[model samples]
Target chain A: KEELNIIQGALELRTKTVEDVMTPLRDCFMITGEAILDFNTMSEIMESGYTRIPVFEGERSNIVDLLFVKDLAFVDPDDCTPLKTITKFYNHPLHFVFNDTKLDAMLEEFKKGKSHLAIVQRVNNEGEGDPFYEVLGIVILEDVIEEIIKSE
Target chain B: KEELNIIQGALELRTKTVEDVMTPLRDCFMITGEAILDFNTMSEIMESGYTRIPVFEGERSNIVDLLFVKDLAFVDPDDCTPLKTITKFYNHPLHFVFNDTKLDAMLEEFKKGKSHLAIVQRVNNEGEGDPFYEVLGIVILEDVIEEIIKSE
Candidate 1:
């Protein structure tokens, strides 16, 4: 099983290199919620087969970052908390980068920051590098974890 | 058992964050290695308790990019008797980020990129952003995963 896993990951890695992973990253529609989704409200989002959803600091197009559904802690079932509060509990926030970057360099940046995925885009060079207009999409972290686990 | 798991992740996240996650940026350690290392070598490094390592491009201090041991894969033996012949692989090898980047922003980057870790550095405009000179430590996806999994 392990060996096969490696083979599969290798094939995947090759494909990602030659083709593009961003082409498939589309907004998950089921996640629509109150600007500040409560714990219970957020859990429903998870049931729809998505693990992570982008959270807004204040703007939607300018995503604050993502909330990994699994990370939401509802220790007190009655907490009735806002998504922002729970997410803000952490010391730091998520990071962002441009799309035109080579996957190799971007991966290195992820390591330095210790992040999970990347928001990719092609540079306009005119937008002050703001909101990478050519953004393809995000790359999920566990998808990569699957391959890493097998190689180990 | 579940409670213990939650405690473990919470403690880990707290400890990690307090040490480096919050304070003004300090030094960065670039834990780099070669991408070509095989399974045995990769395993040996993991046994040492490292969650992430940078894979380099030959002698360059600038890593080719980042990779988590778990997400990496070996070239299939059957695909080519000598898998070394498979020259290229995944384009975005890993996801790393910079210091001072909001953790929330980093999370979005990770989610979009599907990366596991990132190499980090303190923001110092005085010098060349030379990979050879500046590099902090790494931010790992597993850290968040552990915290999230514990919530479950």
Candidate 2:
């Protein structure tokens, strides 16, 4: 009875889209490529406590690849290295999805690979026309998991 | 529809038991009251990366309370204090239950008690046999979450 209700409540998450649970574009903690790879900068990024960060070429909104903090294990803090060196070790490719993609499908994609974050591109719903891509925000596995925990 | 299946699979966890998800007694990390609280012991435990450890007065079966490792933040490791001094900071009382107790029920109890771990006792179903209070295992919220993830 109560258990069933709990299960049913959690099941509702399947109906949600990445847009509903995503960290909006304004709030995403991201970094640009132009930043120097100094110990101070790397230390600040680590202290941000984000497992993954977006690396953009020109603007924070123009994410080229998602950076995995685990890659930092390969570098020494004392040795000055280019930020791009760490970016090369990102290993996984950038994954993108429509902002309206079902979170359930997004979760499956997250489970399948090294990619934990996806660049969300909004789908323009023009009548009887193909949708166009417009970068909206990013969605990560953490966001989906947070949604599940919130549902509980 | 594919998403529906994933949700339904995870929901099956509501019907499972603590026995199905617990780390058996043979695998639990526990300590006795008399162990010295030195930097070495603290370092070793911290290295193991377990948030909670069972503290026993006598045998491992006689668990007194769960020692939250976070409590160590309050005391200096070099202070040469008895382990019991750190144990005193274990604010939560030991929660115990039968191994066959439903996970949903255990989750509820954990929520109410604000506990993450519970000592589990094996159930003896033999006719008219005296039920022993023998601690057979330990269950934690992580175990439950793992079970949920596994079901998916």
Candidate 3:
């Protein structure tokens, strides 16, 4: 009976949207592409405990790519590789989702081997174009899984 | 209905044990208390994509405490603090469970705020002590959640 109740709660997660579970951009660990790739900067980024770090183009609102830490293995620290090279190598495809997208739909995309992190865009009822696609938050696979389990 | 079948499948998780979902010690990212807290070590641990890292006494079997990466905020970089000090301050109480423990039971304990990670010990029918209680694996809350979701 208890397990049934838990599963029922988890099932309800299907109704929630990305906005309900995303980590707001203000709270995200983001960096501009121009930042130096020194030991201090690298260490700070590493210590932030984020497996996927977003790389912005000019400002926080202009996120371009995601930096998956696994790609760091390809670089030699002593080689003095430009920070852009590391970022370029690690910058896998970016997946974007609307803030209003249902969690189940997003999970479906994830289950289909899509990107692990989705850059969430806020809903714009107006017909505007560029500004309507502004980055609102980030929804990671881990966060979605946690939300699903918390439902239980 | 689709949701009902998913729920029914998820319910089966209650009968499962930690052994079914835990990441084996051989595959886990663990560190020793005496290891240096350099940026390399930090980056390596972070790159493992684990939020909580197990700290061992001497050998891998002798796990003492868990080091939550969030605790890194309290340490001073220039002071050259050892990894052990950072681990000590953020090392919350350790939670252990036998390999045969029910998944639901552990989930309930986690729901009640026990701990996020549980050190899994194997059962020894030999009636011995230390050798009998082998550190078999680690079960994190996220694993359980993933297992439940995978049931769908």
Candidate 4:
């Protein structure tokens, strides 16, 4: 009887602020399985944003141990995919983070490392060696640009 | 050391500061091994605020080299040295920058070249490759805007 009454009276708590559910900058996608680029592929990706693109050597997602989008170019027109070999030019290592990591922690990591973006993780229920659930997508300085520059 | 530094200090500083510096953005070089122009190349780099991007193939940097100069990468079309890969003709390479470069130097470089962008190189004690951040931002000529408008 007591449990039933408590459940029936649970409507008393409420809040009016829209921030509890809505934020203007939440429209970004958590991308995964980035395409490898040659000259042709690089051109296609450049027209769209994502300043640094994840490029893999093989089919594995975690294999992002290889290259970046900026390392390659897209001005050639004669290959099946011009960007295929462009990743070879990159010598810089890729970095990653977890989706649940605090934004402050992410920012600190980027500043200290001078890293351009953070690729978040999606943990697997099975707990494998390399967590390949999916990349929560990237977080760049541009994501927080508006908040930092707002004239309060 | 103080007596030796007095008269020569100004000359030494000038010599140290005056040298050939690379631009933050390099003219896009197209590789010879790769095919050219299966896709769209930029017609006018001014609109995009960039002067150049390297055109590569299958991850190789040596081939598919083309400079999208003054938005006119392919005007005559017969011109070699990789510029032939571009399909559109618009503008030229005129913007550039460098890593750890102060804004004062950027303005000065732009003024001297009558251009805006520079392909920058990373500070390397040991010169292996150009290194990341070697080719950086392509700066635009802010003064050129006035000149262009006045001419029109």
Candidate 5:
């Protein structure tokens, strides 16, 4: 009875999109590649409570790589490794999804182990060559999972 | 179809217990009040990828309070505040549950906003006045959510 109602609600999630669940870039924690790694910045990163952080190139709009905090273990306080120097951070091929991508399709991608996190973007059709993909936010696999559970 | 099968598996969670879902104490992150928190320790705490952590007294078994990572914002790295002195970390009462607590009941408690995290314990009945409570692990609301999602 209750379980049936819960599933019926969850079924509706097939219509939901990344835009519905993603944490916007304004709210996301992004580190610039040029950032000189220090205890302050490192501590800030840690306090952000984000393990998988997106590393940006020139601005927040250009996400170049993903960083795993565990990779920071190798840093020496004296050496002060700049974010760009630590190229070992990302290898799991950064995935990007359109803001309009259906939650069901995204969930399937998550289940397939392609990537757990996707940089959510909105494409602009302004005289497009390749289309100016503006970074909107990020959607993690857990976001999709939470969306399903939230339907309860 | 797929939705029905997912719900059927989720319904089986009514019979599941905290023991099935909790991250074990050996694998859990606990903070000690007596320890001096430096940027290294603070950064480590951030990298631990846990927002909510158990605070213990004397030993790991005696969990005294809960700590939220955001509360660490007050600490001046120069002053080096010990974990105990800056005591604004916990106010939402720390909850404890026996490892045998049913997942369904735990989920209901989570829904009612009792606590997002619980210190998992086991009662030893041997020669007991009040019975010895052994701290076993911790379970967060997300663990339950993950369990529900994992049913898919």
Candidate 6:
């Protein structure tokens, strides 16, 4: 029965939606693209304790790129490097996902991207059918792995 | 729809029995546990080209353990080391699985056991009672991953 139950769990893994497991939009720890990297700003990002953080352009309305902590390794606090100046920072495409995307499929993207977080967006379906979207939350691969450990 | 269909694959992965994905008993390239590791036998094992091969005792009736080509690293053909003398050979527990066991479950055992091959057995329900099982086939994790790529 234990053997079969894991199969059941694997099946269950797909049945759930990505939205169900995503950390709420309010819970996302975001950084501004224009935030100059002064000593305090660098300290703030480190203190946030997130290996990867979302960098929003016009506030959290849009996440232009994902930021990796290691990218800031060479920055000198005296120079106050603007977060946007890191040329390679935007090299990785933002994994834009919908609220209703399947969890298993999201896990697949996580593996390919090899990054921990994704920008979750929702349909701005005010009237319908224009592909309008807005940043809604964050999906962490760690949470997906956690789901695997605890459930499917 | 493609999203949920991949979920369907995740479901299909578990529902399929290990038997469906297993290499037929006759197809598994097996080595005799008591066979001397002569140069010829070593060459035969290598030409078979399986990273891991099953070892049987009483002529394939029972797979006592699995043999890794890497484990044969230190063997000397001149010494003609008896295959049974590699003390660490049996240190890993056999991932004994039944034909009816779920494929996903067997995949889990493959990870924990850290070995690719499992001894697939069948119930010798001669009269139904007593727990008699017989070696029926071999399940390879490689085959499981193949199923993952092509189907699931």
Q: How close is candidate 1 to the true structure, as a TM-score?
A: 0.36
- Give the least accurate 10-residue stretch of model 3 chain A, judged by summed lDDT: A71-80
Error of 4 at B67 (Å): 12
The residue pairs that clash in candidate 2, if any, are none
- Docking band of candidate 4: incorrect
Tens-place lDDT per residue, model 1, B1-152, is 33333334433442344125522223322333423344344335434434344555444335555444333233221232221222234334544465656543544455565565666655556755543334555666554544423334
Give the per-residue lDDT of model 3 (tens digit) for B8-127. 646767688989999999998888888776656655765676668889987997999788766654343445578877766666788889988888777777877958799999867675
Tens digit of per-residue lDDT, candidate 1, span A1-152: 33243334444442343114343345533233234554346435534434456664433445555665444433222355665665667524655555444433443354455466665545565765464355455654454444422433
Model 5 chain A worst lDDT run, 10 consecutive residues: A1-10
Compute the TM-score of each model's chain A versus the native chain A and list the values: 0.57, 0.81, 0.84, 0.53, 0.86, 0.83
**Winner by TM-score between candidate 6 and candidate 3:** 3
lDDT of each: 0.44, 0.70, 0.73, 0.37, 0.75, 0.69
Off by over 4 Å in 1: A1-19, A23-25, A28-34, A37-40, A57-60, A75-77, A109-113, A125-135, A142-152, B1-152
For candidate 4 chain A, the 10 contiguous residues with the lowest summed lDDT are A9-18
lDDT digits (tens) for residues A1-152 of candidate 4: 21222122211112211121112223432223344333334445444444455544444344354333334333343344434344444455767666555443443454465575655555777654754456445556434322221123
TM-score of chain B of each: 0.47, 0.83, 0.85, 0.36, 0.87, 0.84
**lDDT tens digits by residue: candidate 2, A1-152:** 43454456457666889999888888989888776655566666655657678888886678886665555544444466777876776545888888778877887787677677889987677747777777888898767765664433
Q: Which candidate ranks first by lDDT, i.e. highest?
A: 5
DockQ, candidate no. 2: 0.12
**Judged by TM-score relative to the true structure, which candidate is superior, 5 or 6?**
5
Native-referenced DockQ of model 4 = 0.02
- Judging by DockQ, tell me the better candidate of 2 and 4: 2
DockQ of 3: 0.28
